[PDB]
Design a binder for this molecule. Sequence first.
Ligand SMILES: Nc1ncnc2c1ncn2[C@@H]1O[C@H](COP(=O)([O-])OC(=O)C[NH3+])[C@@H](O)[C@H]1O
Ligand SMILES: Nc1ncnc2c1ncn2[C@@H]1O[C@H](COP(=O)([O-])OC(=O)C[NH3+])[C@@H](O)[C@H]1O
Ligand code: NI
Ligand code: NI
Lengths: 519, 506
Amino acid sequence: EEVLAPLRLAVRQQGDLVRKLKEDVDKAVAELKARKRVLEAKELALQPKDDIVDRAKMEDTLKRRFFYDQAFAIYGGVSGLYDFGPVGCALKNNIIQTWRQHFIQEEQILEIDCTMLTPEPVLKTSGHVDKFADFVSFNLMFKTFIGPGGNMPGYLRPETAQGIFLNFKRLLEFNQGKLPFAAAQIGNSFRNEISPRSGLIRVREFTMAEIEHFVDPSEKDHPKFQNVADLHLYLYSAKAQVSGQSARKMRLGDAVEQGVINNTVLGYFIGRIYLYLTKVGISPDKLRFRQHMENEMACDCWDAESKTSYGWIEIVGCADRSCYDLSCHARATKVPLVAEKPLKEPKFQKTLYVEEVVPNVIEPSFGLGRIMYTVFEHTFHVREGDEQRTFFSFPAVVAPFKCSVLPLSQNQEFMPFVKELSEALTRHGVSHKVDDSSGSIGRRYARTDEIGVAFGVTIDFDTVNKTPHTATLRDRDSMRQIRAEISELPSIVQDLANGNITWADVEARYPLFEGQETG
Amino acid sequence: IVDRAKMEDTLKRRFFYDQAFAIYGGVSGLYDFGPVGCALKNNIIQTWRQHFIQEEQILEIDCTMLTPEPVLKTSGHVDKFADFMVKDVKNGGQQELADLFVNYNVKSPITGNDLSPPVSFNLMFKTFIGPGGNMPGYLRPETAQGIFLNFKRLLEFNQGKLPFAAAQIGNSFRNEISPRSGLIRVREFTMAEIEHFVDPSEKDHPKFQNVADLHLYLYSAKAQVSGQSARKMRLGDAVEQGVINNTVLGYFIGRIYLYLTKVGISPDKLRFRQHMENEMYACDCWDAESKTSYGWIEIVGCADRSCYDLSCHARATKVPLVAEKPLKEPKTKRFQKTLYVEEVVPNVIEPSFGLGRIMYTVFEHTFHVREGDEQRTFFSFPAVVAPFKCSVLPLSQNQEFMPFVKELSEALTRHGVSHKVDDSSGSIGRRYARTDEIGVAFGVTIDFDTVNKTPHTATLRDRDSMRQIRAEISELPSIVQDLANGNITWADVEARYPLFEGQETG
RNA sequence: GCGCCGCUGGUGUAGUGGUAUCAUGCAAGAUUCCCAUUCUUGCGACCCGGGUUCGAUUCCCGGGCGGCGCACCA
RNA sequence: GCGCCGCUGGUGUAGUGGUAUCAUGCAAGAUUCCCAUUCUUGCGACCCGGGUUCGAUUCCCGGGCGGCGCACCA
Ligand SMILES: Nc1ncnc2c1ncn2[C@@H]1O[C@H](COP(=O)([O-])OC(=O)C[NH3+])[C@@H](O)[C@H]1O
Ligand SMILES: Nc1ncnc2c1ncn2[C@@H]1O[C@H](COP(=O)([O-])OC(=O)C[NH3+])[C@@H](O)[C@H]1O
Ligand code: NI
Ligand code: NI
């Protein structure tokens, strides 16, 4: 704070220096941007405990165990293109599934599925075509042609949003002409980046989950907002940024009423995003919501930024883009894209009975790749004893493998019990990994922990020797383990994977494991 | 034997799917799935994951759609679907050939026409990666290549042991000349593909016994040349007779049948056709075909691709793609060395699922019209795949019903049961029609007995039969949920619950 | 792609060189109280561009889309 | 994109104008019987194309990819 104070002051001076420069585009918010960048960097350099991940170790684990890899690596690879392996894909679908329960099923959102191929007039209308050609000229989008030859120039969608806007009329009709409603699409988006860098952070193809919440401007207040009002989270307002200030933990309700956040609709989604991101493993102490300043924005915009080894990175944008995309496409195509509400008292010799409503749009955009990479960092740990033993503390709900089945030895008496358990878990819908390899139980614990297997069932000698056949259940993080009846462990593991019990509750109900005594 | 027009009218009106970019004129071969269609699709995909990936512990991966040119050159897709064409130019780089064609003054070998300079004719979607344009690429025409190119790490993930299977679910692109017939011929469609890697020595599947008893229609190549029609056979009994080459092909054929059945394709309008030697390399191929108003269409293609995929890519990149297994004992010019393991180049069995066609088949196989009203159309979607498991319906717009609607909906949501609430203006029969139309599996109706009787009970209605029972509102979510998971059927419900003889109040 | 015929509210449908009929659907208010009830009101359309014309939804051309056929079908 | 430095089994790391070290990982056999145990054996690598050369993983041009810094960031 002693080293940061002068840089804070500096940002502040050039801050409302700018406000003065317009109080009565020569002006350089570029100068302001530089100063804040300095402050940002040095605050970052001052903070580490070191509190932060050994990126090279974590990337090694991800690589070795095929969480994700360079696409076409066998052909030399293509910059900015990545494939997800078994664990990567599994973790992804879990993150997407949780996203579906958290947003779509919760708010009864209308999820649609649109083509990635997009004709040129659509993107010229939204201004994507005009805004992303550059200095021979090269476009930051992927251009292609549809059909015969070059009869129809098209692009790969840069975003998922436009498919919703263009289907507004049938979406609205499906909600029977009533506002408000929301549509969503989960799919891939394409950015022909001139320089893909930092692994999954900036890629040329990535999976995006987008939501367009359509709402009557006359009615921009969310009914469920007090479900998130008392949440305390870090906010970084435009005022705070230009004041040279840092982020500040506030109450959501306060920030909305004080007017820091425009409305309770935008606020609701900020709160819901917070709840979601933390649910999938992102750390609250390493998560902030940063408002967009004047030189980056639309009524209001807030990015969700997570602190990583690469610094602060946006993982979820949440914009208020009242009227535009609906209006822009409307004029472009001459097709009216609006809602209507019946006037109470009918009304320029025409008598009106309804008034047309141009809906406002609230748009949360989720970059699942970055969200996933953030989870990787925020859940990566190294065992205190063995530096080779690394593991991921994935929340049970998103852990790719909920369980592992482990005979204590390659010994044969265990094998029928192992077969029993796998099929049982398979019929309980419980994702599991069976390891009956030549390695010791410690080696195979290490393998399983490495990919974030939530719990480990170990078949021992007392599984076969004593009257009630009982295996041990092991917690990935604490490495502590209990003992329970093979009959019921698939139910117990299923429960932990769904979040209907916690490991503390399990340790409470079932006896602790002091050790083998049959041998 | 369906009214395809009427069905498609329903699909269009309730936004199952639609022409992509319709308000911009539209683009042929491109379709956007609306809420109900998307929902149905997701259930189809999840059922697929449960039926295959989870059941066989398959390694599912997720690759990019952008594919560099050399990859598709190797697999042969370029030299067959990407070329300039006089009709055709290769017979004898870019428009460098146009000069060559004029320099040697090549008229057509037939008819001797003067013809045109070669113009590019891409059946694939070409594009350029990077800012330079030094890296031409295509949208993948299939999801298999991502699996083949990551074979080493997949094998390593299975600790080097064969056999193992990998799968992928994503979009694939084909720049069709003439997109037609709705979803049956599109330019972009979601595909589910499995690559089952097996030791050529042991081209078997231990779990074939689980499907051997299935009676299904088979249409072998030797029966196609004869002219005779397809025969209903025991799946096990196609295998000892050598009609089906091996237990691996047999197992997947069985599993494909059980899946297509489970999602609602009618067993009588489903057959498996063996590819003839005329249409092939590859060891053997059996397509799953379904009977539609467009005829017999291929919706799942089960192929046997001995080696090529792994071998071609290996030879192309000079990167060996093999499994090794140990020998019983070390064995021994060109011979002087000691061997301890032998290399195995995996044989690949490939079930290929076209989700769009599968879904369209379900549409035609579950579309029905009520016996009284010709406006009342509905889909008999199986509960486990139906886009909306349940609907909440107040008998009227009276305020007495509203609080029960609100409570039951929230209950359903917390149980995860996907539901739709129709408390709008219309009558009860209207909202029944409205919800049957999109194939809502079951309908909960809140009536006057619900508000005026000692324990609060509502009715649960079956979409198909239109019959209904009565159970209390606390019970219904668990009931509907168990119907959706396939735990119970309607028979079970009518056995445990009182049939609805009419309301005694109001 | 090549050939023919087409494109009118969300869905159908009538009509025409002077900007459009009527059903259905949805909305509102009544009615009704278990299977698109009935009444009244309201909302919503000539695929797009160009040509000819004082004026085009209508006539000519082109593009887009559609239906059928031939062609191709990783 | 520009700039600078890099690319050796799945991972990490020596080394060289005559095709390569040692760990780690996996496999097999023993060992051990609750936290990468131990011994033996086996498997697997010079990013790719062209050139120079009797011969290149090594030297030289080009390409791809990676790590950074600056840009840009729907
Ligand atoms: N090149 C890239 N690579 C990976 N992820 C990206 C990306 N560009 C954006 N994202 C992620 O996708 C989200 C949306 O990106 P965006 O803000 O550029 O687009 C939109 O918001 C669409 N209106 C971001 O919040 C970010 O997490
Ligand atoms: N143009 C198209 N439109 C919709 N679905 C298609 C399609 N082309 C192929 N499919 C679906 O994809 C599946 C596989 O197609 P294919 O046989 O051309 O490719 C293969 O051989 C898989 N390697 C088919 O069974 C079909 O269901
Ligand atoms: Ni029409
Ligand atoms: Ni290496």
